[PDB]
Amino acid sequence: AYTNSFTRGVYYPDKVFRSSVLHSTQDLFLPFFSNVTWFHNPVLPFNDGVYFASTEKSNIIRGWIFGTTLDSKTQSLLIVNNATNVVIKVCEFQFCNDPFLGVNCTFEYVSFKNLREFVFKNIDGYFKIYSKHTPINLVRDLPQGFSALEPLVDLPIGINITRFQTLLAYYVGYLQPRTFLLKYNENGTITDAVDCALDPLSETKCTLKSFTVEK
Amino acid sequence: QIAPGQTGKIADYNYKLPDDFTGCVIAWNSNNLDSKVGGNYNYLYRLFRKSNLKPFERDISTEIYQAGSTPCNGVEGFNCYFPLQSYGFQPTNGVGYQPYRVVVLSFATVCGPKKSTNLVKNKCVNFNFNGLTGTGVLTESNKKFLPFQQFGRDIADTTDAVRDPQTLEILDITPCSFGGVSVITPGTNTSN
Numbered sequence: 001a002y003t004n005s006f007t008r009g010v011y012y013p014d015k016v017f018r019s020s021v022l023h024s025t026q027d028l029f030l031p032f033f034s035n036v037t038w039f040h041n042p043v044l045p046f047n048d049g050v051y052f053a054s055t056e057k058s059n060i061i062r063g064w065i066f067g068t069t070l071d072s073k074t075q076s077l078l079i080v081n082n083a084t085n086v087v088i089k090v091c092e093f094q095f096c097n098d099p100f101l102g103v104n105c106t107f108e109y110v111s112f113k114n115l116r117e118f119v120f121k122n123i124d125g126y127f128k129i130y131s132k133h134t135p136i137n138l139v140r141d142l143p144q145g146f147s148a149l150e151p152l153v154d155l156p157i158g159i160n161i162t163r164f165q166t167l168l169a170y171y172v173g174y175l176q177p178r179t180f181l182l183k184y185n186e187n188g189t190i191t192d193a194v195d196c197a198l199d200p201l202s203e204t205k206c207t208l209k210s211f212t213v214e215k
Numbered sequence: 216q217i218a219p220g221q222t223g224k225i226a227d228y229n230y231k232l233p234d235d236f237t238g239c240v241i242a243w244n245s246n247n248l249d250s251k252v253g254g255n256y257n258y259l260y261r262l263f264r265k266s267n268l269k270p271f272e273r274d275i276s277t278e279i280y281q282a283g284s285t286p287c288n289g290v291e292g293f294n295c296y297f298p299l300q301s302y303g304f305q306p307t308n309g310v311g312y313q314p315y316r317v318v319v320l321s322f323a324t325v326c327g328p329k330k331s332t333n334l335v336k337n338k339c340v341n342f343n344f345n346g347l348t349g350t351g352v353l354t355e356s357n358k359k360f361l362p363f364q365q366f367g368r369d370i371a372d373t374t375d376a377v378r379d380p381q382t383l384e385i386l387d388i389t390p391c392s393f394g395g396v397s398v399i400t401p402g403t404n405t406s407n
């Protein structure tokens with residue numbers, strides 16, 4: 001099963017305040033209007049990075065597992081919500097053939113009505129987590145809208161990752177190295193964005209470096 | 216015996232360091248806690264072992280030695296010995312027979328401390344904040360960074376504000392002062 005991504009999958013690409021300016025940038029971004037795979041816990045490729053988003057009603061979706069082989073052969077990431085806490089560890093975990101939750105280490109840390117949005121990418125051995133949360137009132141897809149994910153967490157893991165899986169609806173797409181033109185507003189929030197390579201009018205907006213063009 | 220390049224009963228059979236060791240060795244006299252008058256036989260050591268260690272082999276394996284050609288199934292009668300002995304540490308031992316606590320520190324997630332100055336406003340300064348540098352006047356600002364934003368940029372990709380990392384307040388960097396020096400003159404032919 002699949003659905004249309006619309007204009008979601010934008011995050012703040014670097015920690016720099018820009019205000020009332022249409023900053024052009026290239027980074028691993030989710031292509032606008034690409035298909036996302038739709039899930040109601042299979043092992044998935046990770047490729048260059050993942051946009052993961054999840055519609056919520058009861059705290060069903062607790063976390064993720066990341067690695068290459070994902071069965072204790074090499075170190076691997078486990079990120080979990082367990083009742084009143086968040087856990088992160090990177091250990092050579094033995095992983096179940098179907099991991100879930102009921103009703104050698106180098107890094108360890110222990111502290112529908114909603115949509116949760118996450119971007120995972122691994123660059124020069126640092127693993128980047130960007131995320132956003134919102135209320136919603138929708139039952140079948142990602143709602144057509146725009147949001148920018150702030151960064152949360154930026155871990156010196158050093159591990160290779162090429163496969164991941166979820167822990168218990170949610171949607172998955174892959175990031176790609178594309179030019180985006182980002183409208184930073186007067187307070188420094190990204191309020192709008194244009195994916196250049198989408199269509200001739202987007203190539204035009206980006207080449208002129210404006211969200212609107214005269215004839 | 217505890218170094219790169221060194222040899223001895225520990226350095227062959229208990230604790231090897233690589234001869235180009237990335238690290239240091241630290242040790243201190245511990246008569247005052249590791250030793251008591253009854254003989255603190257608590258600490259053991261590998262007095263015998265076949266072949267030799269590699270660096271960092273904490274080989275806990277404990278079976279009877281046996282030298283030359285003899286079989287040995289315990290009993291340890293002749294030419295074969297149990298591989299460990301205790302240290303007989305007592306507070307009355309002489310300095311070289313006293314116990315010493317050793318620590319070896321052996322060597323991206325670890326760093327030494329990076330130390331700030333106090334912060335000066337409204338003066339020409341050669342500044343550094345987290346990863347960056349500049350020359351400027353640093354001044355208090357009415358900008359409002361988002362909680363994760365650290366710098367702030369001018370339109371031609373020139374940095375013009377920064378968050379102080381210790382006190383989470385925003386500074387409006389201004390360029391340090393420069394200008395042309397023009398000399399305005401009647402002709403020399405007139406006056407100097």
Ligand SMILES: *[C@@H]1O[C@H](CO)[C@@H](O)[C@H](O)[C@H]1NC(C)=O
Binds near residue numbers: 001003034035
């Ligand atoms: C896959 O994406 C295309 C748009 O590129 C869309 O037309 C098609 O219906 C999608 N496939 C499925 C199974 O939804």
Ligand SMILES: *[C@@H]1O[C@H](CO)[C@@H](O)[C@H](O)[C@H]1NC(C)=O
Binds near residue numbers: 083087
């Ligand atoms: C979550 O699990 C960790 C062990 O990984 C435990 O220390 C922590 O107390 C648990 N938290 C809650 C809220 O149950």
Ligand SMILES: *[C@@H]1O[C@H](CO)[C@@H](O)[C@H](O)[C@H]1NC(C)=O
Binds near residue numbers: 185359
């Ligand atoms: C910027 O944030 C402040 C709250 O700190 C808010 O009052 C103001 O309206 C925001 N400005 C814009 C343009 O949204």
Ligand SMILES: *[C@@H]1O[C@H](CO)[C@@H](O)[C@H](O)[C@H]1NC(C)=O
Binds near residue numbers: 380381382
């Ligand atoms: C830095 O230390 C001061 C106390 O001198 C404290 O008030 C401030 O919140 C601390 N800031 C951070 C980011 O830890």
Ligand SMILES: *[C@@H]1O[C@H](CO)[C@@H](O)[C@H](O)[C@H]1NC(C)=O
Binds near residue numbers: 404405
């Ligand atoms: C300028 O100085 C020269 C001498 O070097 C003199 O001959 C000439 O008359 C002077 N002219 C004027 C306008 O002062």
